[PDB]
Design a binder for this molecule. Structure first.
Ligand SMILES: CCN(C(=O)c1cnc(C)nc1NCc1ccco1)[C@H]1CCCNC1
Ligand SMILES: CC(=O)N[C@@H]1[C@@H](O)[C@H](O)[C@@H](CO)O[C@H]1O
Length: 335
């Protein structure tokens, strides 16, 4: 059942690595900064019941069910195991406002929130934009609840991530459509390869085709900062670029950054090409300095992986439509 409404959420861009917007939970609304994440399916925010021995709970906005007159208890425990870290807590229900749309939503109140990585997060929590099939606890995701109301024009949502981390718009999510202000040319669509995941077939990864030669998978993950591949995939990619492996990233001498070759991802009969300016944090041009690349190793376990993940590095260049009605992802050139 489709309506006549389009809505948007304005996003903040923290340092090209974290894109997040505001949601309101409870009555009166308690405001949270949240990543809208196509790589997961659950909503969660940190809880007032989080021990303050978790220093991440000292430095973030905490949802207090005891301040909301529309809260409904559930209390079922949940653990969310991401590739970057784990959160745990319990289920609650309350009214959530996102882009002036109001829904009754089941979400996680997080009581265990490790310092790494969450002391490095500008955002407080996550809004899972994935499918109910990957929701821990089988909890109906927020976009499915919004769709139930019959207000949105289309069963789609779209992401714009800007390149500029103060006057500028950091990014934008359109619920119920896409914004022509932020893309140009036509959309090119790739249909989903697997039930309940924003994942597509990829036909090759080229440097200057030396990877994914007989096919592989790409998770399109709005909640991830970087492009990732498996450890073995990224090892071969990075040897070809001449980059040095550190603990949590790969780097190149800053003077070498501009000389680095294009990296192309073959998706649905189009080649999607990033130049070095799209994947190098070009912080200086000195030979004495090291500059980090926005491509990291991430071994994602079954059944989602092994897989590449196309995060904000990719989405900055390519405006992305997530089409629930037709089970496809559309890309167009961002502006
Ligand atoms: C939100 C948890 N995620 C992060 O990768 C992540 C971890 N830690 C920090 C500090 N930031 C993260 N995301 C920054 C960001 C926001 C939007 C674009 O990138 C992932 C978990 C797996 C599903 N996909 C999302
Ligand atoms: C204490 C409480 O509210 N428990 C509920 C349970 O009764 C319900 O079956 C489940 C699924 O919705 O959610 C939880």
């Amino acid at each position: 059942t489709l309506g006549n409404t389009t809505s948007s959420v304005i996003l903040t861009n923290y340092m090209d690595t974290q894109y997040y917007g505001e949601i309101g939970i409870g009555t009166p609304p308690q405001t949270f900064k949240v990543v809208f994440d196509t790589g997961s399916s659950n909503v969660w925010v940190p809880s007032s019941k989080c021990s303050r021995l978790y220093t991440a709970c000292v430095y973030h906005k905490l949802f207090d069910a005891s301040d909301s007159s529309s809260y409904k208890h559930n209390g079922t425990e949940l653990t969310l195991r991401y590739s970057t870290g784990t959160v745990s807590g319990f289920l609650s229900q309350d009214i959530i406002t996102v882009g002036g749309i109001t829904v009754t939503q089941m979400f996680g109140e997080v009581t265990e929130m490790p310092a790494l990585p969450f002391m490095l997060a500008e955002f407080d929590g996550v809004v899972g934009m994935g499918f109910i099939e990957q929701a821990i606890g089988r909890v109906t995701p927020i976009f499915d609840n919004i769709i139930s109301q019959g207000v949105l024009k289309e069963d789609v949502f779209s992401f714009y991530y800007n390149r500029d981390s103060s006057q500028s718009l950091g990014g934008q999510i359109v619920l119920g459509g896409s914004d022509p202000q932020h893309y140009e040319g036509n959309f090119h669509y790739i249909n989903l390869i697997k039930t309940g995941v924003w994942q597509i077939q990829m036909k090759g990864v080229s440097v200057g085709t030396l990877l994914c030669e007989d096919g592989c998978l790409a998770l399109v993950d709005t909640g991830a900062s970087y492009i990732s591949g498996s450890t073995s995939s990224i090892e071969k990619l990075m040897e070809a670029l001449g980059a040095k492996k550190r603990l949590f990233d790969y780097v190149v001498k800053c003077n070498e950054g501009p000389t680095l070759p294009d990296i192309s991802f073959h998706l649905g009969g189009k080649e999607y090409t990033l130049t070095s300016a799209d994947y190098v944090f070009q912080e200086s041009y000195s030979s004495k300095k090291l500059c980090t690349l926005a491509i990291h190793a991430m071994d994602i376990p079954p059944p989602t992986g092994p897989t590449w993940a196309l995060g904000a590095t990719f989405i900055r260049k390519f405006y992305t439509e997530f089409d629930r009605r037709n089970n496809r992802i559309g890309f167009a050139l961002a502006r």
